[PDB]
């Protein structure tokens, strides 16, 4: 009907007017007198070897010592970052893996990819080996991300413009999230594990609600696909990294845009976004083989994590904020400090 | 300066490394082919000659081929195409009998243009398959070809085919200096497609070896 042509437009106009009225000044004006962080130096403390193909994802454990990585060679290695040992090496059924996760309790890991199936593995077994515990199916597109809520629940985002919450024992979809008009590429979980956000190719991000399962807010402003997202440690803001060489920081309460992190010399897209423990540093992985760190309150490039020979595809920061680990397509993991 | 448990963990890690190296060495000796098409274009015939990703394994002359079909993905093609950046060859299947149906020839040409000029497939050679020879001949000897290509100016015969069709398909490849394109007619009962695939793979492997040697 024609109603989509006038009520939708007037509601969008009302939203824009409300956002503009609620905007008095910028974050830069508030943090104009803040002392700059200054130049930051980071060195390659460790280097993990053993992968024979491009690395697509990684995740830190809750003890800040163990991490899991996934690559195209059909392997899922669990490293010991303190001594560069290999605790486990799980052979995947399908080598087209593009995501991985680590359970908060350290008992299970998850992986998925082009097979549209999320697999859950058990690490503490009486037989001494690692065997798949559950295979979740129901998505009609490639699965791009998966995060563990607890030992019993997990959320996933696939290319079929939907996000779903699973129940591991039964294997049925407890809730389904709809509303995106493009491929969903990444998601992040709030610190209280009650809300989460998703970044889709629609050049927009949405804030969902795990409890009842409906979209709460929608954030626009980007100009291309969104490849990464991450929650601020406070839990009232998040950062997105798109393909137009721009990182942006939104705020849930203000429902507006706070800053944009762009430079004239950057033309390549962002593949990963992460924060520091106190939220003063924002780390991003670019396609130009580098990894820039940004003053989250001043939008000033404070350092460069150079030293990779291919595209940086993943990024992670430990829970205690003691190290940064990067993985690139040259099959090498480096733990900076 | 390590303890007994640390030494045992190091030994286990070394064993894991050995297993990983052996698996990688075993896997590096196989040939990977990516299969593309415009849908119901004869891919079923090709796969019978020898949800998501569908893999096929077949052996010829003591060589292990792997064939990937991506027909099950309705999502955007520019978000996962970079996964197959190391495939040795690309197999493209086109149905010659779709020239006067709803137009599909133009869609196949557009898909070929998109695939052949991607920033990722700058080196990988592409093998072109044209199917349905007999039915296409039966159709052309009755229906004119000018309906689908207005610019065509020639007689209506089979000999006119394999011209203004395969040459025009090869004309979409405006990167002739790096990668080659092989075209081969085929039908339901030929039993020789595997030989052509093997020849193309051998040529690609020879070129890759010469490039790696630095010569």
């Amino acid at each position, epitope marked *: 009907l024609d109603q989509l042509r006038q009520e939708a437009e007037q509601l969008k106009n009302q939203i824009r007017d409300a956002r503009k009225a609620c905007a008095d000044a910028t974050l830069s004006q508030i943090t104009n007198n803040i002392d700059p962080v200054g130049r930051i130096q980071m060195r390659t403390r460790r280097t993990l070897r053993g992968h024979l193909a491009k690395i697509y994802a990684m995740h830190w454990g809750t003890d800040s*010592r*163990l991490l899991v990585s996934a690559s195209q060679d059909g392997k899922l290695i669990i490293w*010991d970052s303190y001594t560069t*040992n290999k*605790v486990h090496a799980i052979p995947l059924r399908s080598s087209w893996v593009m995501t991985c996760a680590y359970a908060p309790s350290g008992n299970y890991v998850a992986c998925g990819g082009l097979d549209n199936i999320c697999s859950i593995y058990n690490l*503490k077994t*009486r*037989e*001494g*080996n690692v065997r798949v515990s559950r295979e979740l199916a129901g998505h009609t597109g490639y699965l791009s991300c998966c995060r563990f809520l607890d030992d019993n629940q997990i959320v996933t985002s696939s290319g079929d413009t939907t996000c779903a919450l699973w129940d591991i024992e039964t294997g049925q979809q407890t809730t389904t999230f709809t509303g995106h008009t493009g491929d969903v590429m990444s998601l992040s979980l709030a610190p209280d594990t009650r809300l989460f956000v998703s970044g889709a190719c629609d050049a927009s991000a949405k804030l969902w609600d795990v409890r009842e399962g409906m979209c709460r807010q929608t954030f626009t402003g980007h100009e291309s696909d969104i490849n990464a997202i991450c929650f601020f440690p406070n839990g009232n803001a998040f950062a997105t990294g798109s393909d137009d060489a721009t990182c942006r920081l939104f705020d849930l309460r203000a429902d507006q845009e706070l800053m944009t992190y762009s430079h004239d010399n950057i033309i390549c897209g962002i593949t990963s976004v992460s924060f520091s423990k106190s939220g003063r540093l924002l780390l991003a992985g670019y396609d130009d083989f580098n990894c820039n760190v940004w003053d989250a309150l001043k939008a000033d490039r404070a350092g460069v994590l150079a030293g990779h020979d291919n595209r940086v595809s993943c990024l992670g920061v430990t829970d205690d904020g003691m190290a940064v680990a990067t993985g690139s397509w040259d099959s090498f993991l480096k733990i900076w400090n | *300066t390590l*303890s*007994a*448990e*640390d*030494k*045992a*963990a190091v*030994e*286990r890690s070394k*064993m894991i490394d050995r297993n990983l190296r052996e698996d990688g060495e075993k896997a590096a000796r196989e040939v990977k082919l990516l299969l593309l098409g415009a849908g119901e274009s004869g891919k079923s015939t090709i796969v019978k000659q020898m949800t998501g990703i569908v893999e096929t394994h077949f052996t010829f002359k003591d060589l292990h081929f792997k064939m990937f079909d991506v027909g099950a993905q309705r999502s955007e093609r520019k978000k996962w195409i970079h996964c197959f950046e190391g495939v040795t060859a690309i197999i493209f299947c086109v149905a010659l009998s779709d020239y006067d149906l709803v137009n599909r020839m133009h869609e196949s040409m557009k898909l070929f243009d998109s695939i052949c000029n991607n920033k990722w497939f700058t080196d990988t050679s592409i093998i072109l398959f044209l199917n349905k020879k007999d039915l296409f001949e039966e159709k052309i000897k009755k229906s004119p070809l000018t309906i689908c290509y207005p610019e065509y100016a020639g007689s209506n015969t089979y000999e006119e085919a394999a011209a203004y069709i395969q040459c025009q398909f090869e004309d979409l490849n405006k990167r002739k200096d790096t990668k080659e394109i092989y075209t081969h007619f085929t039908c339901s009962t030929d039993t020789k497609n595997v030989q052509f695939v093997f020849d193309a793979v051998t040529d690609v492997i020879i070129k890759n070896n010469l490039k790696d040697c630095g010569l």
Partner: single-chain antibody
Amino acid sequence: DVQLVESGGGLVQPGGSRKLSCSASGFAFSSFGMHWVRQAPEKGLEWVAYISSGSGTIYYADTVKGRFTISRDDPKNTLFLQMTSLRSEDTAMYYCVRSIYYYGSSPFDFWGQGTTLTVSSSDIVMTQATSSVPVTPGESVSISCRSSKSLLHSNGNTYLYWFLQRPGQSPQLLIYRMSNLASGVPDRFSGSGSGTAFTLTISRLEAEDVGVYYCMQHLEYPLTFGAGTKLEL
């Protein structure tokens, strides 16, 4: 389920030889290191030998070095201990203990059933001076084990283990690395202390747990057990 069974005992004349076999079924035998623990009639436990995963590392007790030989058969899941020039001091029941080593693992997890043998006719020292503690159920008891050398390594780990052996049963693992609790063990037990002095605490005492308790180290590969303390009544 997981179980280990071994056999090959009997009566052997002095100076002879006998071959022992351990049959393992129910777990990945290729990824586990296998020990060999003996037990004299009434003189506690004693380490004998060890073989790593892949047979890349073998150690022997100094008492039986040279005379004894230990080997494993991964394809058929069998552990072998070939021994020659047997002496009258080797009459003891032997056990079959598995152990897997990695970050956060639990070595000495499952103990075999045990086989008996009869014969016709450095070196860290621990003290378990206290031997008999008769306590009625419902109370709390404490056990003390002391090491000659401190068991606290540079990396922060304390390689001390606790074992319990109910009467007429194989020993069972209770605590590893002096603070962690083994899987399947009730939370009543709790081990703590410092270097060179360790203790084990039982909060609420009940029935099926009366037996002999042992302490063990894992720093340098000559392994030593305690004298063994037991609970009466």
